[PDB]
Design a protein around this ligand. Structure first.
Ligand SMILES: [Co+2]
Ligand SMILES: [Co+2]
Ligand SMILES: [Co+2]
Ligand SMILES: [Co+2]
Lengths: 295, 295
């Protein structure tokens, strides 16, 4: 629909991103950080597509603070900020790696540079694999491993990950064809570890999924609120940490989870605890070139 | 449409597959082999979906003989046989690894076992990732690496690789949902190498793609032949070696290649030249279980 909305989300996400890079100074508490970003996005004119992700070093992604996290930045950390905005369901998913209180290095360069290459070739008509390979070369020609299980994704109205991915590697059969009006989030992750990530507890981000009559009353209602307040967008436990006792909240979520009403999206950590750089922009696949909502 | 056709394709491919395993005896010339299989498929009632693939050891796949290959099997080889049949476009892609003149081992077991698991969970409703994970565990718990760039694919009428894949790894965002009536080819590849494949020349298989006003004369006729007899389905170079002398043939292809008419699918070889075992069956995603065309 309104390409302007995909643009607005993109525009907000840009500004907020920029500012986050700034608040990203040593000792800065992750929790303050997130809150600021979310409310900014808010007062700026839009709701978040998903809770800001502030992932540090080996924590690949899927990490968001919660009312209680004492964690603060530390000089030399590889902080990764992945933000997403949405105007009525039109997402903008951008992200950047900041070496806390320091300047970028070869790793960070590899991810950024990679990401860039992908854009230069995206244009209606090309097969996904081309971006894939592009990304792979930049990362590997710099001696770095690209992650093989975290990757770009195609966005759709009120659907963050709509089905088609954009690997950071070259898989010879990825032959989906970038159509016109296509909206894609390109996001190469680079690492010095093995190049793969595993899920490790706790589960901070969750996803609403399906109506499933639950017996335990409270749970059911917790869900109902969920339905109506977040929708199809993934949300944070931190976002509900005050709508009921920390204790009783848990179960409700679990029961909801053990019921398949909502899916939990645990923290993603590089297998051999390798540093993880990352940059992501969102694009709209046009005929001869792509427009970057988050430029 | 006719589930019976998907069944028929499936049925032929089964028989043929079975027989190939037998013809797979030492010193057996790969070229005799392929010919047999293809003609059997033929006389059995159907056309091949793609040229039989006889891939040996570190040759992951995409290898097919050509009029000229002197290559003969050798005791101890890990021959991989990937066959595909199609009834009016309803494919059946099945495949197996045979230790030439020997009995299967841990590797081969891993890939097989892996494949099985995937089926056990396939059923309308699950997310692709579940299968992915499944595969990953069987292959890895046996200390073997799964290939990360070769993987299962969703089949559709006259479209071998229709877009959605089924990774041999767990990528947390593979959330496509197995619908009812879905046809998928699950195919785990296992290897002791690194777990990745690269393209290496030559280019034996090719695939039509789009009508391009070409300048050279014979290519143009070659184009319209490819168009009429092969179609959207991929072909082997071995299938056209009669239609014209070596030299002229090549060029008509090459022009077309450049023309953007037919894409060529080079050989796939495991990077650290590691052994590659593989098994593949095609399924139809039904409500509570899946029907395996190639059982
Ligand atoms: Co993102
Ligand atoms: Co993203
Ligand atoms: Co196959
Ligand atoms: Co296949």
């Amino acid at each position: 629909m309104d390409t302007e909305k995909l643009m607005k989300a993109g525009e907000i996400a840009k500004k907020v991103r920029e500012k986050a890079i700034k608040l990203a100074r040593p000792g800065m508490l992750l929790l303050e950080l997130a809150e600021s970003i979310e409310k900014m996005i808010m007062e700026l004119g839009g709701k978040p597509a998903f809770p800001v992700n502030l992932s540090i070093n080996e924590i690949a992604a899927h990490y968001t603070p919660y009312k209680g996290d004492t964690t603060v930045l530390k000089e030399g950390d590889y902080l990764k900020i992945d933000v997403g905005v949405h105007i009525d369901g039109f997402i903008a998913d951008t992200a950047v790696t900041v070496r806390v209180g320091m300047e970028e290095d070869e790793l960070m360069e590899a991810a950024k540079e990679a990401l860039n290459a992908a854009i230069s070739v995206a244009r209606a008509g090309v097969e996904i694999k081309e971006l894939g390979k592009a990304i792979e070369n930049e990362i590997r020609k710099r001696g770095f491993k690209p992650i093989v299980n975290l990757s770009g994704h195609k966005i759709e109205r009120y659907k963050l990950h709509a089905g088609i991915s954009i690997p950071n590697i070259y898989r010879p059969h990825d032959n989906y064809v970038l159509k016109e009006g296509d909206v894609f989030a390109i996001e190469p992750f680079a690492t010095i570890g093995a190049g793969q990530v595993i899920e490790v507890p706790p589960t901070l981000i969750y996803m609403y999924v399906r109506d499933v009559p639950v017996r335990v009353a409270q749970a059911r209602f917790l869900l109902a609120k969920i339905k109506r307040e977040y929708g199809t967008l993934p949300f944070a436990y931190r976002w509900l940490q005050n709508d009921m006792p920390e204790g009783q909240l848990k179960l409700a979520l679990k029961t909801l989870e053990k019921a398949g009403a909502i899916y939990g999206y645990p923290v993603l950590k590089e297998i051999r605890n390798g540093i993880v750089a990352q940059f992501e922009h969102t694009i709209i696949v046009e005929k001869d070139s792509v427009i970057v909502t988050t430029e």
